[PDB]
C-alpha cells in the first residue's frame, strides 16, 4: 500500500539524470557523483577500479538508504587530473576487462562439447 513501484528501481523519473556531479568542499580536487536508479552492482565495481588508478587519492561509495536505488561516489585525485577523467578511464577499463572476459568465455564454450 505504501509500497513504491518496482520499476522505480531502474527507470529514471521526471527530470532525473543518471549522474549528478557536485564538487566536494571539504577537500581539494574532490567530487561527489550521485548515481540514480543504480545499486551496489555498479558502485562497488567502479569504486574498485578507481582504486587501481595511481593518480586517484580517494574513492568510496555509499547507498545511503536501501529504500532508494541511488548511490554517492566520492572521487579525489592528484593535481591536474579531473576526477571526471578518473571515472571516464575507470569505466573504459571495466568495459575492456569485460570484453576480454566475453571473448574468452565464448572461446572456452566453443571448445566444450555439451
Amino acid at each position: 500500500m505504501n509500497a513504491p513501484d518496482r520499476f522505480e528501481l531502474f527507470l529514471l523519473g521526471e527530470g532525473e539524470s543518471k549522474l549528478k556531479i557536485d564538487p566536494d568542499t571539504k577537500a581539494p580536487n574532490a567530487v561527489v557523483i550521485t548515481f540514480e536508479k543504480e545499486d551496489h552492482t555498479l558502485g562497488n565495481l567502479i569504486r574498485a577500479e578507481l582504486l587501481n588508478d595511481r593518480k586517484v587519492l580517494f574513492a568510496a561509495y555509499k547507498v545511503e538508504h536501501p529504500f532508494f536505488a541511488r548511490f554517492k561516489l566520492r572521487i579525489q585525485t592528484t593535481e591536474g587530473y579531473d576526477p571526471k577523467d578518473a571515472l571516464k578511464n575507470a569505466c573504459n577499463s571495466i568495459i575492456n576487462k569485460l570484453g576480454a572476459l566475453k571473448t574468452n568465455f565464448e572461446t572456452e564454450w566453443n571448445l566444450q562439447t555439451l
Binding site: 552492482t41 555498479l42 567502479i46 571495466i94 568495459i95 576487462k97 572476459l101 572461446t107 572456452e108
Partner: protein, 266 residues
C-alpha cells in the same frame, strides 16, 4: 588470452562450472549480481480470466502463470511495452498465449506449461514458447480439474528483469567461491577443538595448493581465481546467462560514460 581468463570445468544445458581468473573480486561479484538481477527474459505479466471453475483462486493461478519459463533466446528482438509506441501492447512488444482447459475425463484432468498456445505473431523470433524440460514433455503443472471444472484465460507475456519481479530470473542459484584454503584470512573459522577437522574441505581445495605451516602469512595476496557455477532456469541457455551477464554489465558501465558525455555538452 587477453586480460581476465576463464577455464570451463563442466558444461550441460542447465549448468556451467568454470574458473574465472585474473579478475578482481568486485568484477566477479558484479557479474554474479547481473546474472540473477538484470538479464531480461520474457514472462507472462497480464492474465485476463474468461472463465474459472477451478478449486484454485483467479490470482493464485495468475501468479503461477508468471513463474512459468518462456523462451527468451531472441528477447532482444522484443521491445519493452514501456517504450513501445502502441496503446498497451503489440506484436513488437508482447507474446499473447491462450490457455483453455476443461475436465472431460471422469478422472482428474491436468493443466500444464505445454497447454499454453501462442496466439500472437512471433515475427519469426524464438520467444514465448513455454520451456519444457521434463521426460514426459508436459512442463509445469499449472493446476488440476474435476468434471465441470473449466479454465479459460488469456496471457500477455512481456520483456522484463528480476529487479521488477523475480519471475524474469533467467538463472537459479549461482555457485560462487574463492580461496578454499583460507590463505587470505578473509574468514575466521569458528571451532571447538580443531578448525581444520571441524570445517569441511572445498571441492576447489584440489584446484589450489595448500599453504604449509612453515610459510608465513602473505599480506601482499589478493583474491583473483573464483570457482563458479551458473544454473539456468531454461529461458536462456546457460552460456548466454554468462555472456548476456557480461554484456548487460558492460552496457551498464557504458551508459555511465555516455551520461558523462551528455553532461559535458552544457
Amino acid at each position: 588470452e587477453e586480460g581476465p581468463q576463464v577455464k570451463i570445468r563442466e558444461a550441460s544445458k542447465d549448468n556451467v562450472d568454470f574458473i574465472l581468473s585474473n579478475v578482481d573480486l568486485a568484477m566477479a561479484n558484479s557479474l554474479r549480481r547481473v546474472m540473477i538481477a538484470e538479464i531480461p527474459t520474457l514472462a507472462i505479466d497480464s492474465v485476463e480470466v474468461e472463465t474459472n471453475t477451478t478449486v484454485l483462486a483467479d490470482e493464485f493461478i495468475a501468479h503461477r502463470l508468471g513463474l512459468i519459463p518462456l523462451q527468451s533466446m531472441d528477447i532482444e528482438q522484443l521491445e519493452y511495452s514501456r517504450d513501445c509506441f502502441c496503446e498497451d501492447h503489440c506484436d513488437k512488444c508482447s507474446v499473447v498465449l491462450t490457455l483453455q482447459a476443461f475436465g472431460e475425463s471422469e478422472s482428474t484432468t491436468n493443466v500444464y506449461s505445454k497447454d499454453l498456445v501462442i496466439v500472437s505473431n512471433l515475427m519469426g523470433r524464438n520467444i514465448g514458447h513455454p520451456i519444457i524440460q521434463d521426460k514426459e514433455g508436459n512442463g509445469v503443472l499449472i493446476c488440476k480439474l474435476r468434471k465441470g471444472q473449466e479454465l479459460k484465460l488469456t496471457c500477455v507475456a512481456k520483456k522484463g528483469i528480476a529487479k521488477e519481479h523475480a519471475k524474469w530470473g533467467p538463472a537459479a542459484a549461482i555457485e560462487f567461491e574463492y580461496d578454499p584454503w583460507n590463505k587470505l584470512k578473509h574468514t575466521d573459522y569458528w571451532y571447538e577443538q580443531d578448525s581444520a577437522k571441524e570445517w569441511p574441505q572445498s571441492k576447489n581445495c584440489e584446484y589450489e595448493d595448500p599453504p604449509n605451516e612453515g610459510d608465513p602469512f602473505d599480506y601482499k595476496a589478493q583474491a583473483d581465481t573464483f570457482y563458479m557455477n551458473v544454473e539456468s532456469v531454461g529461458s536462456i541457455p546457460v552460456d548466454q546467462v554468462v555472456v548476456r551477464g557480461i554484456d548487460t554489465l558492460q552496457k551498464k558501465v557504458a551508459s555511465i560514460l555516455l551520461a558523462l558525455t551528455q553532461m559535458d555538452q552544457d
